Design a binder for this molecule. Structure first.
Ligand SMILES: CC(=O)CSCCNC(=O)CCNC(=O)[C@H](O)C(C)(C)COP(=O)(O)OP(=O)(O)OC[C@H]1O[C@@H](n2cnc3c(N)ncnc32)[C@H](O)[C@@H]1OP(=O)(O)O
Length: 577
């Protein structure tokens, strides 16, 4: 690989940055105890320097010293059910399908797009991406592509595990029934015309009452430990091993959803993609372990549910946008399943667990249309920095406090680079939000403007630092797991209540820009948090906001309102004179 290896930040740089990031997010007392804790950990000849030495060694022996640690910490270790908690959804524009054939024609074409896109992939014919935005021109890592269709996430009791065959095939799910659709014989990739024909056969078969099998997919929408256990039960029978193996070895799935009941709003269409609406809608017409699940609903609701561990939103969207821009026949096989009274019980639990997730998701698509990048650029500001500050102002004006915030910073500059964290809850953002919201202080508007720019200055400074591998989250993560390898009892540095708080991201954000008329979204990462995915355009900014109804403190409608208001105030501050 001609790409640089992810840098190893100097120990003292990270420890200083660490403390600086949290000072204003914890009490004075607690902060004093942490300074002391950090001081000892980072003292000369201390424990910190010892771990750093191990890290430099690991760096030299590996391609990317955090891939393993990060992949397990961020996704494989998480026990929450994938729907909403982990697996994001990309929603395509609304389609219009008068007759079933219009739905199946779409699905056929889409599948042909997948095939040829997998061809370019297999022949490394895909053009190597370059940076754009913040520090642009350099080559980017492409490894994430080659994870799009070649992955499956196996459940495990405490830790999940991430992952050619012949014939090559896709699994088509209709009416919660799973079918095997071979798409490539001997490098012969079926015609869009024959794929259509095969799909009509599946739809017909999935409508036979005497053959209808139990909704096994439902099992994959359950907590990872629960699915690991129920799968252990299935594995006892040979017929189930077989079908599971088939699902495990497919390219992706193609879900032919039944007509959704509600209105086809952007919000409702997204709900359908995130969780399918529960077991009574399309909630079982899935298999979350698989990487990509392309949805082609009868009514026109389409998109693709994605299993996060193998790749991130940027890569996914380029493939997706490429897919859409592109846009003797044996019968398809139906996967068999041999259920027992055990499985019947498990399907019941999953059904109830999945209903809570659907019942608990408070989601909304907000499109800000007063202005976009263009206006922001006219203020000598980074659109993303501006938007990140906007979100801080929204959280504070609504909740009266700032909280540890997360923002996906892509590090694909380096080998196997995924992402590091940009902590937007800066001290300069606290001073800005306090000046704007504290009426009593009567801070002059000209002063608010200064603080606004200073805030946008710190966000951009952290961003630059994060995308160049000099941030602090991955670094600390690596130091933590190395120490654990030394002794199961972690140092006080990582048992400190301060370190623990810094990682509960009550505000989890990311940017997924797209040229098309599609958008990305996902659930919060903590019970009392928000999920904010935005798409900044020249004149608009699309906000996808999520939170949990279980937390009386959060509200996606109120937060969206608060974002609008924050963007308006900032436009006003910038239009003074
Ligand atoms: C499953 C999922 O979906 C979740 S996974 C997460 C997926 N997303 C990511 O990983 C985020 C990837 N993006 C990055 O890492 C970026 O570096 C981040 C940190 C988001 C920053 O994005 P950027 O593209 O740099 O945005 P930003 O600088 O604000 O805006 C870029 C434009 O804003 C301009 N600009 C920046 N500072 C400016 C300034 N001071 N004055 C005038 N213009 C400025 C840039 O020149 C650029 O112009 P153009 O390309 O539109 O012609």
């Amino acid at each position: 690989s001609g790409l640089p290896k992810l840098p190893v930040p100097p120990l003292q740089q990270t420890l200083a940055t660490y403390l600086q990031c949290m000072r204003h997010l914890v009490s004075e007392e607690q902060f004093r105890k942490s300074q002391a804790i950090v001081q000892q950990f980072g003292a000369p000849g201390g424990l910190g320097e010892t771990l750093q030495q191990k890290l430099l060694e690991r760096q030299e022996k590996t391609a990317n010293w955090v891939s393993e640690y990060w992949l397990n910490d961020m996704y494989l270790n998480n026990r929450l059910a994938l729907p909403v908690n982990s697996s994001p959804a990309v929603i395509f524009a609304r389609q219009h399908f008068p007759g079933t054939d219009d739905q199946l024609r779409f699905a056929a074409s889409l599948i042909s797009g997948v095939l040829s896109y997998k061809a370019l992939l297999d022949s490394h014919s895909i053009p190597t991406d370059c940076a754009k935005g913040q520090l642009s021109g350099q080559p980017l890592c492409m490894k994430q592509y080659y994870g799009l269709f070649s992955s499956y996430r196996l459940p495990g009791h405490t830790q999940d595990t991430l992952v050619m065959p012949e014939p090559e095939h896709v699994i088509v799910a209709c009416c919660n029934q799973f079918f095997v659709l071979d798409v490539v014989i001997n490098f012969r990739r079926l015609s869009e015309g024959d794929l259509f024909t095969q799909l009509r056969k599946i739809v017909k078969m999935a409508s036979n009452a005497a053959a209808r099998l139990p909704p096994i997919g439902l099992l994959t929408s359950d907590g990872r430990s629960e699915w690991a256990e129920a799968r252990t039960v299935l594995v006892k029978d040979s017929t189930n091993r077989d079908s599971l193996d088939m699902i495990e070895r497919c390219i992706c799935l193609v879900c032919l959803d039944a007509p959704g009941g509600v209105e086809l709003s952007d919000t409702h269409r997204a709900l359908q993609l995130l969780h399918g609406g529960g077991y009574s809608k399309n909630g079982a017409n899935r298999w979350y372990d698989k990487s990509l699940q392309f949805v082609v609903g009868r009514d026109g609701t389409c998109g693709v549910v994605c299993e996060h561990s193998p790749f991130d939103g940027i890569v996914l969207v380029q493939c997706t946008e490429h897919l859409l821009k592109h846009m003797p026949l044996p019968a398809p096989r139906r996967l068999r399943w041999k259920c027992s009274p055990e499985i019947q019980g498990h399907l019941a639990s999953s059904a109830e667990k999945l209903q809570r997730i659907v019942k608990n998701l408070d989601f909304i698509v907000y499109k800000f249309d007063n202005y976009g990048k263009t206006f922001i650029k006219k203020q000598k500001c980074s659109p993303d920095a501006f938007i990140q500050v906007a979100l801080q102002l929204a959280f504070y004006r609504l909740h009266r406090r700032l909280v540890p915030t997360y923002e996906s910073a892509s590090i694909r500059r380096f080998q196997e680079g995924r992402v590091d964290n940009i902590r937007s809850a800066t001290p300069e953002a606290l001073a800005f939000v306090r000046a704007v919201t504290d009426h009593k202080a009567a801070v002059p508007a000209s002063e608010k403007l200064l603080l606004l720019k200073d805030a946008i200055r710190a966000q951009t400074a952290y961003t630059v630092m994060a995308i160049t591998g000099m941030a602090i989250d991955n670094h600390l993560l690596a130091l933590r797991e190395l120490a654990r390898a030394m002794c199961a009892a972690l140092p006080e540095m990582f048992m400190d209540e301060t370190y623990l708080m810094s990682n509960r991201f009550v505000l989890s954000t990311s940017q997924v820009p797209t040229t098309t008329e599609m958008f990305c979204c996902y659930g919060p990462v903590v019970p009392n948090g928000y999920g904010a995915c935005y798409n900044p355009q020249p004149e608009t900014i699309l906000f996808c906001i999520s939170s949990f109804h279980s937390c009386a403190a959060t509200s996606s409608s109120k937060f969206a309102k608060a974002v609008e208001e924050s963007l308006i105030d900032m436009r006003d501050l910038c239009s003074l004179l």
